[PDB]
C-alpha cells in the first residue's frame, strides 16, 4: 500500500504541471491512476513513480530462505503420509462417486438447444507421491 507524493507550488500553475517527455513511463505512471481520496485531495500534489531497487544478492538470499525457512523445503526431513492418506482417499473417492451423478444426468439430457468436477488432479498427485515414497522407503535408507 506504500506510495510516494510530492507537492506542487501554486506559483507556476500557469506553466504545465509536470512536463512529460516519455510516453511509456508516463503511461505506466498513469496506470496506478489516482485514488478516490487521492482526487479528494490530489491538488497541490503529484505522485511520483516508485520501484523496488534492483536486488540480486538480497534476492538470492531470500530465495534460499524460502526453500528451507518460509516453506517446507528442509530437504532432509522433507519426506500421516501413510496414516491419514487412506482416509483422505476415502473421502475423495466417496465425493467423486457422488459427483458422478451430475455428469450422468447431463449426458442423459438430450440436445435441448455440473459435470466439470476435476477432483482427479488432487488424487493423482497425492497418491503418486505416496507411491513414489517407496523410493525413499526401499533404497535411500538401508
Amino acid at each position: 500500500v506504500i506510495d510516494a507524493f510530492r507537492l506542487i507550488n501554486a506559483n507556476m500553475m500557469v506553466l504545465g504541471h509536470e512536463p512529460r517527455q516519455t510516453t511509456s513511463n508516463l503511461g505506466h505512471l498513469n496506470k496506478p491512476s489516482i485514488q478516490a481520496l487521492i482526487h479528494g485531495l490530489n491538488r497541490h500534489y503529484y505522485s511520483i513513480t516508485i520501484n523496488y531497487r534492483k536486488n540480486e544478492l538480497e534476492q538470492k538470499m531470500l530465495l534460499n530462505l524460502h526453500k528451507k525457512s518460509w516453506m517446507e523445503g528442509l530437504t532432509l526431513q522433507d519426506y500421516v503420509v501413510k496414516e491419514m492418506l487412506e482416509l483422505a482417499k476415502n473421502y475423495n473417492k466417496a465425493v467423486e462417486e457422488e459427483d458422478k451423478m451430475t455428469p450422468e444426468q447431463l449426458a442423459i439430457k438430450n440436445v435441448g438447444k455440473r459435470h466439470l468436477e476435476e477432483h482427479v488432479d488432487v488424487l493423482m498427485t497425492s497418491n503418486i507421491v505416496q507411491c513414489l515414497a517407496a523410493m525413499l522407503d526401499t533404497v535411500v535408507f538401508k
Binding site: 493423482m124 507411491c131 513414489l132 517407496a134 522407503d137 526401499t138 533404497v139
Partner: protein, 152 residues
C-alpha cells in the same frame, strides 16, 4: 510344388514324403511335422498306408510313445522305411528327465552312466530335487512413466 499338371503320380511320392515326415519328428520340428501333414490331406485320410506309420508314431508321441515306443515298431516292421524307422528309434526321447529315479524310483546301467549318468545334467536323481528393495528400482521407473504422461 511346381504345378506340373502332367506330373504322373508314383508310389515313390508317398514313400519319400513319409521319410521327411518321419525325419521331421526325428529333428523335433514338431510344428513342421504337422505342417507337412496338412500338406497331404488327401493322402492321409484313411489310405496311403505308406505314410500311416509316422502319424501313428506322432500320435503315440503326443500320447505315451514312451510305452508305445516298441508298439509302433511292432505295428508294422517295415513300410519301405527299414532305415527310415531306424533314425527315429535311435533318437530316443528323454523328456522324462523331470522326475526322480536312481535309488528314488530306480527304473524308467549305460543310461545311468551316460555323461556320468542319464544325460549329464543335475545330480544323482535320488538327491537331485521375498524382496521389496529389488522391486524398488523397477517400480520407481514405472511410477514416473505415469507422471511423464501427465506432463502434456
Amino acid at each position: 510344388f511346381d504345378y506340373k499338371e502332367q506330373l504322373p503320380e508314383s508310389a515313390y511320392m508317398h514313400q519319400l514324403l513319409g521319410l521327411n515326415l518321419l525325419f521331421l519328428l526325428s529333428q523335433n520340428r514338431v510344428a513342421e511335422f504337422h505342417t507337412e501333414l496338412e500338406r497331404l490331406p488327401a493322402k492321409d485320410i484313411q489310405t496311403n498306408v505308406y505314410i500311416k506309420h509316422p502319424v501313428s508314431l506322432e500320435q503315440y508321441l503326443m500320447e505315451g510313445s514312451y510305452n508305445k515306443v516298441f508298439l509302433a515298431k511292432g505295428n508294422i516292421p517295415a513300410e519301405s522305411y527299414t532305415f527310415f524307422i531306424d533314425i527315429l528309434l535311435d533318437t530316443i526321447r528323454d523328456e522324462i528327465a523331470g522326475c526322480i529315479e536312481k535309488a528314488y524310483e530306480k527304473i524308467l546301467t549305460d543310461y545311468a552312466k551316460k555323461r556320468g549318468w542319464v544325460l549329464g545334467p543335475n545330480n544323482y536323481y535320488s538327491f537331485a530335487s521375498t524382496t521389496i528393495p529389488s522391486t524398488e528400482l523397477a517400480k520407481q521407473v514405472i511410477e514416473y512413466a505415469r507422471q511423464l504422461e501427465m506432463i502434456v
